Symmetry: C3
Subunit: 458 residues, 3 copies
């Protein structure tokens, strides 16, 4: 049996945040969730997450895919593991211990760690890495024979030990039985006055039990995030990982170091992404679609062959061949049918737009059901709100909504109808009719010579 | 005589694209075109490009500045060179062989390669580089005396040869006569079952003929692009090269690592470019012009002293001193005269705008001929389309187009005229006249207390 | 006593600019000002800045916090220091000499430099660093005993000296008395025919006086900016420094390598900044505020809990809880009250907006005094200009301004009033009234079948 203990009860003072450190997001999900996903790879029979600081909030995210234990007082990583005793003490197996603030460690690395622990028959295996800047990390102390002696914390380290480049990642595999026994022998006699889980290594060394170290193939994965500088580094590595995956799958990136794509976004092959594109949440991008600089898509599905030019799209569906932008805003609950064109400075919200309809400019379409082949002249405003309630407008197929018209819901524009430009519409317009609601033009000869803008008046 | 063979017939499976690999763009032009430009530096008497996979498409780009030979089946780089036998076999001279997927090799490096081949009197000179990550590249095998023995491909390499850091760039210079003779001795006995051009090196070694290696001064230039991860690296190096050139010429970049300027864009000294600016195609930027974050210019000429603030400009001419933005869109076939101001949320298309005219906000000017000193009030819409045809509007000098007016083409607004705000204009407005086409305001005392928005009704 | 000499009279030919090199900005202020700020840390009793090339302009920036001396002809760094003789010759103390084009040297490093000069009792201490690319920098020549012999300039260096990696940063501390005496012994016998300040090192070596070198702890700080490539590097290092500071203070950055925040911008803890955000000048951001990709804020104060979504805000005040964007433009002299919402394609200028007012779309509010709980329908345009003068509009509390209305200043919309959508308003609207100024809708049955957009006509 394999067990897993995730430490997530720490205060994260260095984060300077009211939000528990492990809940800070990296590429769209909490660091804790990235850790949960990696832990999942070793398929533990039992997973125990230790919560403390604002345990209330932490238990929210994934409150069933693991057991929870509360650490009333954050007395140390070692003490946090102690909190799992009621559930794990007494069982036999291999127990993975991992921090909730090391989101870059992969499930593959954990599986490699477990495999190594088993094959070498260690009582404890430490996941390690090397770095030129080990400040803040426990250092792996070895002897002339490269044998692991112990782990020394930054605060407790001497000037000499601080020069060690091999660091403790905060992840280990322990024989479950021996783990809790060794735990009984740790105390708060250190620079932090805390119960260090790292002290069990020295304990196993005293008993002569086998202690090994499995080194990460990719040292970038070792990042421990204690502050926002490290969080930004975590974002950079995860961003590179996600984008690398998309490029391998056939997606071109003008600049993968500057494109922000969340962990679960799906992107089909042949999609072209310019730099500075943001794709978040449950977003899916279809084949050959082009996303230009500035595009920001959240929880939306975009079809194939679409061209999203510097536009923001939220909780919406965009069909194949659609063109949006530049500077368009497709708000929640919108659906853009096949080959629809939404041009610059257009806002669509809570509306369904039929195939081949076009709204090229300076338009607002809200709470509307719009047919196919409809044309919205520039400046068209669908009026749907009266200060208390929202009203719906239905627009048929092939309707021509004149430029600068004002459509006051609830009304229906029948198939093939035309609304004259500049018109305010307060009543239904029958299919095949035209509707005009505007003042007639009157010219006043020479009147301009009397006004401030005239050249002769300045 | 100098000859050049460009290999561009490969399938590029790793690219996962329906577009032939060599046609993928880097800074605005295909990798193949960057290679063509470098080959041009050695001024070959004959240039032969080998096409195969979708030869149809490849022959499109530059179908005269070189000879073409078809490779029906892609049996290997060696076999591709064989396809040029009908044209080059029998001739005397130095033949450059280069891949169409190594777009960073410069003409200067090729000239250095040729010079070295000649001075050292080699029968074959390989252009090489060193890299910590040689995966996928042929490795340069040498003896204790640093003599070139052969080139071994990744697939065919043993675990030991894979540790070689010196790689084959895929570019060489060969005595033309010996090249084709050695070619007769290559076969498909390898891990890929292909005719490797790299096997001629081992052949020259058997005959004792002189084989040399000329190393790139800049190892970044050695990049071979087989997938989109490498393509993005190619974009990064080329972007750095282009931007470096502009900075040397007096252009300031807030962040040259995040500014996207195509290979042939011209930029005058003293231009200031914020980060995240995109300049594409045949674009030219005049002296002292400021381009702010988000600006996207395609095939346009912008004058001197202009300030383009986060705006998109396409196939247009922008005169000196013009200010555009933020969030403006100058569409194809527009000309903005000197000192014109286009403000936020304005779209100009197929229109000529005279000097000093201003359109500061939420306006659409389409298919219009507009004079000098004209003022477009916010919300002005020029209506030019009836669902079938486009109509033109002519606006004279010093015209004042009232806010939220709707101008229905075809009409002419005469010099100095004024269109009242909120007016729909369907007829010509004479010079010096004013035109008003809107309903008169009527106030209904206390009526608001009866509506949903009123505070007493909620 | 401590004295300081800042060299800022050079021509900066390599900058290819009409603006004196030291005045080019890095993170919002001139390189010269960054140098002034560092010099300030050693609290000199006298500060003398040497000006020459366009001295007029240079004296502008900070024309009181230092003494100025003119160098009529730029004959060299050594000659520039000579220009300070009338003020400093004869005094006793330690004199810091620093270039105006090394903006990354910190006050802390200068304080360390001075401390080292004093403790080692040197007659001259050179601030040095190491770099793999020393091209253009004076090289620090030492003997087998690591003793400083002299500094050799790039132009004057032999092929052998050019391989030296230890460079002169252009900053030194000299015993003031000895400095000017040694200066008497320098001449223009060099590759540049200039009086090199660097030659005084060789002079002190002849007299046997103590010469030391204090090395920068951070080599990035050593950058000497002679062209725009180096200026961009200066921007990158300063940007990293500023952003690092904000992250340490509790601000999260999705990408600190691509976020552009000026040197004096204040940002409260818990603020979240996406990549590609620009904050300039005297900007202040309140706690927990979210700034999304593309936001550009200049000289504005933004409160706590605000969400600025891809919008440009200039010389304005934004209260707590305000939401702006996407694609909004808050222009100079605007104040947005608490909980105000400004949506997409809205422009606010010279206007005060009361608490909880909303303007969600395609609206222009200029020169208006707007009350609380006001609602601006999409397409609303406040008309404030007649081609010569600007007029003000006053809008009371709870006013409902209908979509696509045109409000022609100067007018007042009384409390709770409603302006009908599509209306042009030319007169005051009393409190509790409604005002309607638009044409009534007329429907023409079957008329559409006769128009170009109708399906039966194509
Ligand atoms: C900016 C872009 O995106 S471009 C694409 C958007 N395109 C547009 O908005 C174009 C819309 N076009 C219009 O609004 C045009 O003015 C149209 C289509 C209404 C003009 O149609 P026309 O038939 O040529 O106008 P016409 O003057 O003949 O009037 C037709 C009928 O309406 C009546 N009418 C005209 N103007 C008005 C008015 N202001 N109020 C009331 N009735 C009016 C006429 O009396 C006539 O009635 P009758 O036939 O019973 O005598
Ligand atoms: C938001 C920005 O960018 S700001 C800059 C844009 N600025 C603007 O849009 C401002 C435009 N200004 C306007 O539209 C103003 O209402 C103006 C200039 C038309 C007002 O002009 P005024 O001369 O003061 O109006 P006035 O009421 O006196 O009317 C002038 C004539 O037109 C007539 N008229 C007025 N309103 C109307 C109407 N709705 N329909 C028909 N005729 C009208 C009057 O009867 C009068 O005729 P008469 O002289 O034969 O009796
Ligand atoms: C897109 C968004 O952001 S959504 C939010 C913005 N929301 C809006 O803009 C909605 C604004 N709503 C409107 O403009 C509506 O048309 C309203 C509120 C004016 C309609 O009000 P109603 O009371 O239902 O209209 P109703 O037809 O009964 O007219 C009321 C009075 O005005 C008169 N009237 C109506 N239309 C007109 C007109 N065009 N010209 C002159 N008088 C008119 C009527 O004769 C009536 O007068 P009476 O009571 O003396 O007989
Ligand atoms: C003593 C110890 O373990 N040191 C390790 C820990 O140091 P480091 O100082 O980084 O440890 P942290 O304080 O961040 O705590 C580690 C993890 O344990 C949790 N936690 C902490 C204290 C507590 O009482 N309860 C609790 O649940 C935190 O939520 C965090 O997820 O991680 C580093 C790598 O990232 C290692 O190099 C250090 O050797
Ligand atoms: C056997 C060989 O040459 N190996 C070299 C080739 O490997 P590599 O595996 O990278 O070679 P590729 O398959 O990409 O082919 C090289 C070039 O030849 C063309 N092509 C390929 C096969 C074909 O039948 N016809 C054809 O025209 C491709 O279009 C491409 O432009 O480039 C590397 C550097 O980039 C070198 O380090 C390798 O030593
Ligand atoms: C001879 C000398 O000093 N060389 C140093 C100078 O070279 P470097 O060639 O970089 O020197 P610059 O020409 O840039 O001049 C140095 C500074 O002195 C000022 N200036 C220059 C000439 C003049 O007549 N008047 C004047 O005021 C410039 O405005 C600049 O701020 O800086 C480098 C580091 O940045 C050092 O490595 C070089 O050893
Ligand atoms: Ca801790
Ligand atoms: Ca930690
Ligand atoms: Ca229908
Ligand atoms: Ca191949
Ligand atoms: Ca290749
Ligand atoms: Ca004219
Ligand atoms: Ca309008
Ligand atoms: Ca100089
Ligand atoms: Ca310099
Ligand atoms: Ca009031």
């Amino acid at each position: 049996s394999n067990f897993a203990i995730i430490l997530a009860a720490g205060k994260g003072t260095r984060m300077k945040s009211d939000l528990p450190k492990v809940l800070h997001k990296v590429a769209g999900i909490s660091m804790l969730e990235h850790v949960f996903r990696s832990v999942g790879a070793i398929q533990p029979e039992k997973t125990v997450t230790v919560v403390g600081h604002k345990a209330e909030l932490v238990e929210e995210v994934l409150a069933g895919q693991t057991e929870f234990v509360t650490q009333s007082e954050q007395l140390g990583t070692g003490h946090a593991v102690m909190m799992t005793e009621p559930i794990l003490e007494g069982l036999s197996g291999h127990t993975l211990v991992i921090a909730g603030d090391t989101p870059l460690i992969t499930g593959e690395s954990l599986k490699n760690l477990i495999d190594f622990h088993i094959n070498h028959k260690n009582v404890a295996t430490i996941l390690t890495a090397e770095t030129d800047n080990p400040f803040g990390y426990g250092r792996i102390v070895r002897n002339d024979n490269a044998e692991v002696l112990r782990i020394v914390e930054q605060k407790d380290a001497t000037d000499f030990e601080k020069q060690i480049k091999e660091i403790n990642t905060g992840t280990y595999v322990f024989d479950n039985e021996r783990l809790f026994e060794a735990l009984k022998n740790i105390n708060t006699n250190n620079a932090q006055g805390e119960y260090y889980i790292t002290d069990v290594i020295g304990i196993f060394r005293e008993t002569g039990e086998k202690v090994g170290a499995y080194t990460l193939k990719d040292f970038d994965e070792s990042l421990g995030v204690n502050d926002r500088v490290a969080l930004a580094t975590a974002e950079s590595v995860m961003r590179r990982r996600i984008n690398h995956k998309h490029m391998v799958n056939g997606v071109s990136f003008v600049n993968p170091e500057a494109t922000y794509i969340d962990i679960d976004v799906e992107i089909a092959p042949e999609v072209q992404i310019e730099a500075n594109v943001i794709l978040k949440g449950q977003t899916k991008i279809g084949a050959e679609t082009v996303l230009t600089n500035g595009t920001y898509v959240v929880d939306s599905t975009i079809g194939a062959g679409a061209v999203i030019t510097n536009s923001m799209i939220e909780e919406s569906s965009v069909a194949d061949g659609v063109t949006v932008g530049p500077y368009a805003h497709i708000r929640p609950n919108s659906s853009l049918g096949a080959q629809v064109h939404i041009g610059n400075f257009v806002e669509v919200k809570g509306s369904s737009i039929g195939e081949n309809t076009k709204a090229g400019h300076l338009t607002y379409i809200g709470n509307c059901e719009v047919g196919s082949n409809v044309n919205f002249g520039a400046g068209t405003i669908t009026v749907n709100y009266d200060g208390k309630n929202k009203y719906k407008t239905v627009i048929g197929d092939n309707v021509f909504v004149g430029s600068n018209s004002t459509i006051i819901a609830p009304v229906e524009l029948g198939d093939n109808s035309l609304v004259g430009a500049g018109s305010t519409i307060t009543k239904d317009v029958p299919a095949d009719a035209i509707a005009i609601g505007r003042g007639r033009q009157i010219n006043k000869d020479e009147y301009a010579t009397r006004l401030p803008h005239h050249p002769k008046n300045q």
